[PDB]
Assembly symmetry: D3
Homo-oligomer: 155 residues x 6
């Protein structure tokens, strides 16, 4: 069928392996994946840098930013699909409310969810930044370039 | 992108507009959709398959099949790399998480993708439709006409 | 009876969890109809309720063959009252009320939170503990207590 | 006013999610008091409600400095009405009602399930989408729609 | 302080690694652990056999059965503690109702919970028996003796 | 069984009967209990520590300490092999699961054991107590007398 683009939105503050698992699991299912960030501990430029480094190895992944509604981004770019991860019930209820709205905003865009893998269900940007603030080891939670940037941040 | 098949599993006893919401939202996003039914409840397998075929024959690319073994083995046999499931509620969510955790052990090449039921159809289930049909309430908002006819005849 | 609230259930048997909700409702409506459909027969269940609510003069006990929302219409009740104990109650009641609103848009379902002492009580766990001869006086009214002890010794 | 129900909130601003609950309550009590405490000032919030409920003759809008349960006492309301949308609403309301019952055992809180069309609407998401110039006519009444467009253009 | 016994109740139909993770995590925290079963696919005698084999290696673990209330078992035996696992929200609400009752039945017995490890959050006796019915591999979910018994059962 | 220490962490701003429910249920089950407080909210650290000490001085074996680093490192420094936490609600549960998953990565020798709050104290939190105290409702059911006195003086 036709050319397909999916958009994976987030603040990526910073990007983690929780985020990359979803991105990686999505690259074989769409022609292109756009990782999209709006417009926190890392600046926009820094967050964009961390993502690009962390998805270097996935040639069908682009990193962009946008100031506007997500569904309007999808519409400019010709994406029909938003991809979101779910780890837990609090994610689930929140994501339900977002999609209910997005469907009002633009009914041609669908949101598809995938369940986080077993090992990553507990990771978020927040808790990684908490562990990094106490300088504990974060190598299992984030890629090597992001590991370096967190350690320099919480020096 | 090469040829994609997605699989929509269920018991469909009977198919409702809650199930069709998901099926019509998936038909444009893959080359083919297989609706896959397992192997009593109130309609036989052959009846459930007939109801589905009549309820989806307006779509271009939806096939209705039975199985037998594991869902993930059905997906491998047919070349589907995706399972599609609807989420309505928190309790759906927790159950689906347990199933996908297991299916990833069984075959980590198959992804399960979820979509949220539309707000109008969240509350519908085969079970509650049969309840209401048994009391002979008007069920035309809940199921397609061919299914409506079959329920009415089941329940008098 | 300008206003009637209906309190449905299986009541197999009625417990102080059910009575909590019933007693809290009495002052808010001219009449309350406890409406019924296991371990106890229908006739038995109805008698256990009748005896348990006889101290509440605006509460009446009935049975119905048909949809709840058609009962409400028939008696002129515009309100169904349901108790909530837990997240699982909440989701289940959300589905039932979504459908009831489709069946009859003019009846509302109102919920009350179970009181904290009675949040863990169901007919099922009372019966289970009764089968083991536990002391059940804190969970059910005296007439139900007797019926449970008779059933299970 | 044999019976008064109180509907509390921040209403910052009132949306059709709030109005859903208010409109569904009007027929069930002699009076409804919408009771108030952000993006809009108190005075602004009160005006937006007043204009949004002027078609409902038994609804009045008030503010209070003090505990909700003391307001209810003061006006003679024995019922607080709250809407439930989701599991997270449910848990939060359970804690508030547990405490309100301790503060005044004679006031009951009754819940209604938000209607399915309006389940996802909050003041917060309406404001967010308004900040982006989205069409908001399906989420808020016309007088609130104007106030949001004025605020955000 | 004094001698301590904890009781880990269940139907163990059959025992899984989800169950054994909790048992194992509990053995260093009490002087004795009693695995207790009341009085399904495996008979009582079979279930007791599967447990004893699976906890052979934990010398402070006993396996018993009882027909009576759990808190009365704890009381006969001098246990002050029931240990239960939690995997998910549905577990949580159910376990809350059980403990609320058990506290009425006997207030001297406390129930302590531990969270299932990441890898075992999805396993139950039920789902293992479903996988075993389709003869898929269950070696990651159950110990070797139980693996053998399931395969012979779903031959 | 050798000497056991269990640690009860929190902010305790201020300690309430909800926190004490857990602390009194744990004092008989370990040799020692450390109540461990982190490192504004409405009471300073030194005040929060004072309130706890006065609220627990009737128990035999409860010490009140501050830290600084990671909880799990506090446990290692002190020889505690157990963290005790109360659960009131589903939302407590999900949050605690995320924390214990992480703490097991940080130190897999420390176990987190949970107990359900008693039904009478489930709804209490430091937050709601301060709310009610600010309106000068009677708070004697919610906090011990020494804490009751301190809240009253905070809020007039
Ligand atoms: C479905 O996934 C998300 C994620 C999300 O925030 C991460 N917000 C939204 C919003 C849902 C309804 C209200 C406006 C929606 C929005 O579009 N806010 C701007 C926004 C945010 C994030 C990005 Cl990456 C962009 Cl381009 C643009 N839906
Ligand atoms: C994600 O969707 C579903 C749905 C579901 O319903 C029972 N079960 C499964 C199962 C999950 C792991 C254990 C066995 C798994 C299985 O395969 N169970 C039977 C099953 C077989 C074959 C078919 Cl064709 C169906 Cl439709 C259904 N995953
Ligand atoms: C807390 O852990 C459990 C687990 C559980 O079932 C696995 N039931 C109970 C029950 C809770 C209240 C009602 C009676 C309680 C019971 O005691 N039922 C008999 C019973 C069951 C299991 C066993 Cl192993 C025994 Cl010895 C004896 N609490
Ligand atoms: C199980 O109990 C708690 C409670 C809690 O509250 C913040 N956080 C933690 C944290 C969980 C993993 C990431 C860092 C972990 C930590 O250690 N965070 C700071 C923290 C430090 C030191 C102390 Cl002494 C306390 Cl009380 C609290 N686990
Ligand atoms: C709000 O409370 C209940 C409770 C409940 O029990 C199961 N079912 C219902 C119904 C759910 C919508 C589908 C039909 C429903 C019904 O009306 N079933 C007949 C019914 C049941 C209970 C009673 Cl007491 C009566 Cl008179 C008549 N709504
Ligand atoms: C049931 O609905 C609400 C809503 C709510 O808003 C936050 N708070 C409350 C309270 C929760 C118990 C502790 C005191 C509580 C209170 O009474 N706070 C003053 C208060 C708040 C809202 C209003 Cl509208 C008023 Cl008049 C006065 N119960
Ligand atoms: N109110 C809320 N309830 C539940 N989760 C929330 C809430 N607000 C933010 N989040 C979560 O915080 C994270 C940050 O936001 P988001 O822009 O989606 O992605 P990211 O984590 O990539 O920066 C998300 O994983 C989101 O699910
Ligand atoms: N906690 C739960 N445990 C078991 N099943 C659940 C739970 N929550 C939702 N469900 C499932 O929803 C099912 C109906 O869906 P399914 O059998 O997959 O077919 P269909 O999609 O045709 O309705 C019920 O059999 C029920 O098992
Ligand atoms: N999926 C479900 N979740 C929660 N409760 C359920 C479910 N299915 C049936 N029930 C019944 O709803 C009950 C509340 O019962 P109701 O219909 O009012 O009769 P009663 O209150 O006498 O039990 C629970 O005690 C249980 O018997
Ligand atoms: N922990 C919480 N969970 C859910 N809602 C919360 C929480 N804390 C505060 N709220 C507020 O409760 C609101 C319901 O608000 P309420 O107190 O009635 O004012 P309003 O309805 O105008 O928002 C949500 O919109 C939110 O602003
Ligand atoms: N109504 C229910 N809701 C949630 N979980 C349940 C329910 N009924 C049984 N269970 C679960 O089924 C399993 C079997 O029961 P139990 O006797 O505790 O242990 P086991 O799994 O060792 O046989 C448990 O893990 C228990 O949590
Ligand atoms: N979803 C959640 N996210 C963050 N915190 C939560 C959540 N649910 C409950 N809590 C926590 O309950 C806390 C109060 O407990 P804590 O800070 O450990 O100390 P204390 O035990 O003294 O109250 C709040 O800060 C709050 O963060």
């Amino acid at each position: 069928m036709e050319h397909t683009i999916a958009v994976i939105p987030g603040s990526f503050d910073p990007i983690t392996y929780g985020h990359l698992d979803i991105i990686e699991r999505s690259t074989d299912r769409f022609d292109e994946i756009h990782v999209c960030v709006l417009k926190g501990t890392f600046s926009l430029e820094e967050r964009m840098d961390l993502i690009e480094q962390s998805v270097k190895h996935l040639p069908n992944v682009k990193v962009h930013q946008f100031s506007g509604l997500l569904v309007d981004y999808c519409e400019q770019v010709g994406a029909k699909t938003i991809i979101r991860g779910l780890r837990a019930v609090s994610d689930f209820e929140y994501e339900l409310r977002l999609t209910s709205m997005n469907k009002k905003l633009n009914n041609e865009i669908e949101t598809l969810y995938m369940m986080s893998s077993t090992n990553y269900s507990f990771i978020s940007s927040s808790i990684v930044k908490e562990v990094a603030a106490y300088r504990a080891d974060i190598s299992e939670f984030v890629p090597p370039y992001v590991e370096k940037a967190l350690k320099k941040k919480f020096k």
